[PDB]
């Protein structure tokens, strides 16, 4: 037994390419479209819930995940890879930050942590890179709102808006037109729904779409009262209902 | 492409594991051995080829006991067979030590199964080159089992593996039909010796030596013991008779 | 974890990774060492594939293991560092335990062993390095010069060279070095070395560094001028004919 | 608390002649004021004409003799049944004992 | 280069062949299974084919009791099936011990899916050629169906099918629901939900069954059990006196 | 205990260390040099547990020398002392801690100033005009607290020691067999071979 | 074909064979012939020693494992040292812990299981040596034949090595006779020398070329070489 | 590729076999044993006139009564010698006696097969076999003067005379005839020196060849050039004499 | 077993070259260009952002210039992910040196360490090398301003002016053409932007595609200052130098 695969499974080709990473990226391309848009007072991330069977219950499966109460993530590519990445991400935010400083990590740093985990699966022995790309959107006191993209290589970059997956080229173009540095959250949510529409074939409603935002604090979602400095989570996942009401003024 | 049969844990395009299938080949090439589940125990029998007059008769026992109530016989690579039994003894010992009660046959079967199935999960190991017939009497009666190199196993009324597994299976299926009300340990012993004699045709080249053991609630008191002396010769006769 | 046997035997009884290691040496800049009757000199050439460096900080080629022993090399630079470190460490350790600095032969034997070890250990490749180690044993004035290679083999030389075109400069040295009478002077010894390098450096007073080691931890590296001068007095020797 | 040591009494004696030697010992084994046995051999023939006795705490004494005898057995295996000289045996016993110096 | 088909590393198309071939193995048994949700029970039906006369039919099954409340039906070779069952049982016992409450169906499914995901990424572990369907009547979620594959994927279902003729069973069920408009079988007793399950299995597969052709597991509030050949027969006679 | 004294004058540091080595009932040596040169301009004196004393000194020496060869440079006295403190600080929480006290006297060729560092086995480091380990302090700290000036010459300093050593031979219970003196300055380290009557 | 399945022992050939084990098994056939046979009172080993030059020595073929057990090898000399040493420890362990002589049947089971371990796990290689073990225990005289595949068998007599089939036929023919040579060692040994000579070809068995060992009832396992075996040539 | 401990279809270990090849390329080495002592001789073989020939150590001392010569990848023998010396000294510490020459050999041979990438038998850590053979020569009270040939295979033989290295097959052929059970140490020295001359490309002098012997009285000694040179001469004369 | 899939990332070619190191370099050659120019009164780091967009946030962005110390910084060319791994170990190394000696780490000492780490992935471990090349720009009281370079191989060297990444041949030539020992920081700053401007694969060298940093001894103080320009600061300097 014993993992004898202590050597790298990702190496340099004569051309200088790292195959496995390239292939991983390819897998991301084949993935369902997902996007992110940063407004002046919030960020929005959304994707399409490509239910793989009419008997499956798409609610029991979320592509938009809360990492910390002010940071959420969404992806494109391999769902299972993303899932374990989300668990690791939630844990690292604790073990490598909250447990040291008593406060949740700022977006760039948590993203930096996730990125590292992916980088390692690109060089460590006996493994393959993760077949996903993430879009992390969060908010921290000294950096405000932010949007990040993390690739299978471990690379990450900040965005005003962007999209990944199937119709990324097309979606990106539609966003470059509609974006401006004066958008209010509601506007971004709207642009979001419009951008997503193009990438969606059939049904397009609050049940086939998944969208969450990072905005104001939600005391109502805290669960307790009595601690002034604790005002509530900024991350909020819209409801099927909330999504449809918007599609009506779409 | 091809070459899906060079490494062990590898899935071929049609979902198979050739290394395991090749193991089966080593099994089929081995001696024939069987197991018959009577109504208060089980009987084990096996073919011992006389490769030469130089082999001390009766001196190279094949059937093995695990604990004090379980019997094991296998066809294929003998050394692999012993290896699996050593594991079984450890597993049985571990179980008893914590739960006090000697390991129930069904529990023992899965212990062997999980272990064997484990040898089809990595390319750093080779699958077992043996199929094993085993069983005994526990708190719920008798149980007979057969385990394949794939780690697959089920409960049987009668079981056979090896060179003459077809003759045997034929004969065993017959018994099943002519005894819907069960068979006795004494009768299973006789019948077993016969089934071995018939199945010896597909190997009638070299001369053989028969070996039988049993575990019966009424005949051995739930303990596993080898059939020898008068009861043994008697079964040899009963077989030598119907073979003519 | 990783323990793959990277250096193994092939049908003809060869260990290619070790041999290929030597090829890396052949491609390295030239290095040479000649021992006089009261000193040893080490010379090395400086590549010119790129020229706009900062010679102040760029690590030189002749390294001090201890105050009375130096080591130069030809081959992979990254590799040579690991050997030089281990050697310097062993040097201090030997002083600490034997209460006496290492002899040049001992230090050489150590380095050679490290190289040999990397030719029959799993998970590692041989050092793409070959070295020249020289100095004077504690309280001894007889100059010492040794050479080691990837295989782990070593031995002493009156004069020797390794690296590119070493074949050439060795020739020059074989028909220019008389054991009967070694360069009785630090000056005439440093001249012979520069001469041998000029056979391959093709005029490059800025591409030739020298280091003179004398008994009792007396080690000094010459400047471009001091060197440039030997280059001059030598080029005339030719013309004057 | 647990005391890993005990005292079984006993007394041994060794005398050398010009072409012979003797090792003697009483055969009484005790514990406090009770007698464990009036005859419990304490001096052993270990082969190659070597006689030995480790007196004091019986458990330890037996363990040592056993370990030495075994040492002799391997000496033969490793050196073609070559006889283990008495001086060599002594150096070996020293290492057996010092091995448990603490 | 051509080894991107022997271990779980990417192919130029960004695919994992070993995972695809694992799926292929799941049909080896040539057995179908389906699960449906009652008003407050969950039922899983699976074909049972024991053609060998020497086998003790009672020892043949692809249905497992993971815990007092969790039941699992497997589509794939028995040895991988048992490897999976054992792990899930251990995962369930351990969870109860640490967290102080019975592990939920969906959670156990998630944990197993993650485990499968790893064989997908680590080169020395091979995926298991099996599809796991977990059922129960969760104390918080009610009747539940969660299935996992060699890809490390999983999700909850209103109802589901697996095996060589998965498609037939699925569309059949899809239809019944497009009709009823509800996400479950509006039936109070499990016996009736079991009957519904077996009936539609017959319709979709165009085959009749005897008591020895099926295997049935039922999950109720605080207990998951399997039916006996006779429990089945009685249930089979019932559907008979409706046609 | 042993006498370990240090006094930093104007352009140098002077270290005095008792020469006696006593074991129980007998004085085994009267010429022991309780010092180690860490680098050409850094000297360290020590006192403490029988074995640890030298083991630790030589260990520190080896490292400082190794750093010198590797960097072809001599670490400042401050840096050397910081290294030593870290080492003792680790030791204090180890399985078997070094029971050693030291004085580090060095000349910072860069700042061009003499420096004196006192460090106990706990890793307590302090920089002082003058210092001492053991009981010596109890006598000398007030002698120097009295007759001490920052601008004193090396000569004045040596006289100040003579003053201290006398008081110690007068009031200390043991016969430390006199001291060995050493001066660290811009030119390095040298020993005052004539102090047994200076 | 074969070339694709003989790179290690963790691979089965399409027909269920283990080539690495088979190749190991070959090293034995290439080794010098050795014979083993036993009556009811004694067990005997006879081996043909082979040399390199005439300036060289004759490599030993018989090894003592305990006072009541010993063996003869054919194949890789080192491996025989390894295995015999392992057999020495097991004999030793049985005595130290249980004050019991290790039964030959048991010694056999141990060897089998030890060998088997290097045929199913990556990285290991099978042993390249055959062993003939004789011993006298609580059930009498015994003879075992050990193969690197792990197969250990109890026989009345046998032979392994080059041209071994010669002696093996002889014994298979003499059986009824030698198995009754009780209370007469010199006769069993002679029967052994006559058996081995049936595998000769090159030369005839000389004094520093023949090796014989014996164990029995009141006979601690002992090896005979040189002049010691002269009385049998 | 293929495991470093794989068997060939002929029942041989590839790495060991190839190991033997590298040894055939080695510099000649010859050992001759006589009732007066054993003689070990070796071909220096300097790869250049600038190489100080006496820094060529191919004959080393194990203990005062055991010395040995090597042939093949000589750097590989350093650890073998270390082990051998340690074994020798250690036996003396534990048994208060000298190590038997044969046992010493057996010890060295036990390291031989300790190679592999994970062989199921212990913890064989060494990525490949040694690429050097050894002629171990010594004397002990049990079997007097002895000469052993130890190879990377783990096996070893005792010889009255043995030649290993580049000219072995030919020199061994000579030794086969030249050697007789009554040779004297003197005779053996010339014999070694002679055969070395026949197989060496170089003109055998006291700089490209080295002699040494082991005698119960003075132990293992390595003949100094002056001594060997006079033996060279003493040989030329005797040969030119007929 | 595994051996079959082992790429053997740490072996010599028959020429005596390290395949992976070579290939890693090959990868670097396609990375955004980075230039380091050292003047008498300071050092300059300039890098071209590879892959940009209207939407790419730049105030938050960093992909080529990382601060390692207060007196040391590096310019990256290659895999950012790989670079970060190394960068962080470097930041730690500097802090350790500081804790041990109570003195800021000498520039070369930090560089030799990082280079050593790389060198390792070259001789053992069976892992791939880091696809990164660093241009080090730092200052200490022993060698003043220094400029270094290290690559996948694990070798490092000092420079007056140097480039890494894409079009280095072109860039090197242009620097070799206009660099002069007596240059002043602002002189270097311009030479830097000009070189990039000439090697750029883009149409124009706009600020949104650059990262800039300078280590100057702010005269009004006496100490050294590290400054990573912000989007606007780069936009300004870009106009003055005459590239608008």
Swiss-Prot record, chain A:
PROSITE patterns: PROTEASOME_ALPHA_1, PROTEASOME_ALPHA_2
One GO cellular component term: nucleus
Keywords: Cytoplasm, Isopeptide bond, Nucleus, Proteasome, Ubl conjugation
Paired cysteines (S-S): none
One Gene Ontology term from the biological process aspect of the record: proteasome-mediated ubiquitin-dependent protein catabolic process
Covalent cross-link site, Glycyl lysine isopeptide (Lys-Gly) (interchain with G-Cter in ubiquitin): 108
Subunit (UniProt): The 26S proteasome consists of a 20S proteasome core and two 19S regulatory subunits. The 20S proteasome core is composed of 28 subunits that are arranged in four stacked rings, resulting in a barrel-shaped structure. The two end rings are each formed by seven alpha subunits, and the two central rings are each formed by seven beta subunits. The catalytic chamber with the active sites is on the inside of the barrel.
PANTHER family reported in the protein's UniProt record: PROTEASOME SUBUNIT ALPHA/BETA (PTHR11599)
Family per record: Belongs to the peptidase T1A family.
Additional observations: Present with 7060 molecules/cell in log phase SD medium.
Record protein name field: Proteasome subunit alpha type-2
Gene that this sequence comes from: PRE8
Curated annotation (Swiss-Prot), chain E:
Compartment(s) where it occurs, according to its Swiss-Prot or TrEMBL record: Cytoplasm; Nucleus
Gene Ontology process terms (BP): proteasomal ubiquitin-independent protein catabolic process; proteasome-mediated ubiquitin-dependent protein catabolic process
Keywords noted in UniProt: Acetylation, Cytoplasm, Isopeptide bond, Nucleus, Phosphoprotein, Proteasome, Ubl conjugation
Signal peptide segment: none
Annotated InterPro entries: Ntn_hydrolases_N, Proteasome_alpha, Proteasome_alpha-type, Proteasome_asu_N, Proteasome_sua/b, Proteasome_subunit_alpha6
A cellular component annotation (GO) from this entry: nucleus
Lyase keyword on record: no
Keyword Secreted among record annotations: no
Phosphoserine modified-residue sites: 228
Coiled-coil ranges (or none): none
SUPFAM superfamilies to which the protein is assigned, alphabetical: N-terminal nucleophile aminohydrolases (Ntn hydrolases)
Superkingdom to which the source organism belongs: Eukaryota
Cross-link for Glycyl lysine isopeptide (Lys-Gly) (interchain with G-Cter in ubiquitin), residue positions: 223
Family statement drawn from the similarity comment of this UniProt entry: Belongs to the peptidase T1A family.
Other remarks in the entry: Present with 15200 molecules/cell in log phase SD medium.
Assembly: The 26S proteasome consists of a 20S proteasome core and two 19S regulatory subunits. The 20S proteasome core is composed of 28 subunits that are arranged in four stacked rings, resulting in a barrel-shaped structure. The two end rings are each formed by seven alpha subunits, and the two central rings are each formed by seven beta subunits. The catalytic chamber with the active sites is on the inside of the barrel. Interacts with CIC1.
Protein name per the record: Proteasome subunit alpha type-1
Phylogenetic classification of the source organism: Eukaryota, Fungi, Dikarya, Ascomycota, Saccharomycotina
From Swiss-Prot, chain F:
Subcellular location, record wording: Cytoplasm; Nucleus
A family per Pfam: Proteasome
GO cellular component: cytosol; endoplasmic reticulum membrane; nucleus; proteasome complex; proteasome core complex, beta-subunit complex
N-acetylmethionine, modified sites: 1
Positions carrying Phosphoserine: 76
Alphabetic keyword roster: Acetylation, Cytoplasm, Nucleus, Phosphoprotein, Proteasome
Functional description taken from the UniProt entry: Non-catalytic component of the proteasome which degrades poly-ubiquitinated proteins in the cytoplasm and in the nucleus. It is essential for the regulated turnover of proteins and for the removal of misfolded proteins. The proteasome is a multicatalytic proteinase complex that is characterized by its ability to cleave peptides with Arg, Phe, Tyr, Leu, and Glu adjacent to the leaving group at neutral or slightly basic pH. It has an ATP-dependent proteolytic activity. This subunit has a chymotrypsin-like activity.
Remarks, miscellaneous: Present with 21800 molecules/cell in log phase SD medium.
UniProt name for this protein: Proteasome subunit beta type-4
Taxonomy of the source species: Eukaryota, Fungi, Dikarya, Ascomycota, Saccharomycotina
UniProtKB/Swiss-Prot annotation, chain G:
Keywords noted in UniProt: Cytoplasm, Isopeptide bond, Nucleus, Phosphoprotein, Proteasome, Ubl conjugation
Gene3D superfamilies, per database record: Glutamine Phosphoribosylpyrophosphate, subunit 1, domain 1
SMART domains, A to Z: Proteasome_A_N
SUPFAM superfamilies: N-terminal nucleophile aminohydrolases (Ntn hydrolases) (SSF56235)
Note from the entry: Present with 7210 molecules/cell in log phase SD medium.
Family note: Belongs to the peptidase T1A family.
Phosphoserine: modified positions: 13
Entry-linked PANTHER family: PROTEASOME SUBUNIT ALPHA/BETA (PTHR11599)
Function as written in the Swiss-Prot or TrEMBL entry: The proteasome degrades poly-ubiquitinated proteins in the cytoplasm and in the nucleus. It is essential for the regulated turnover of proteins and for the removal of misfolded proteins. The proteasome is a multicatalytic proteinase complex that is characterized by its ability to cleave peptides with Arg, Phe, Tyr, Leu, and Glu adjacent to the leaving group at neutral or slightly basic pH. It has an ATP-dependent proteolytic activity.
Protein name (record): Proteasome subunit alpha type-6
Any one GO CC term of the record: nucleus
Superkingdom per UniProt: Eukaryota
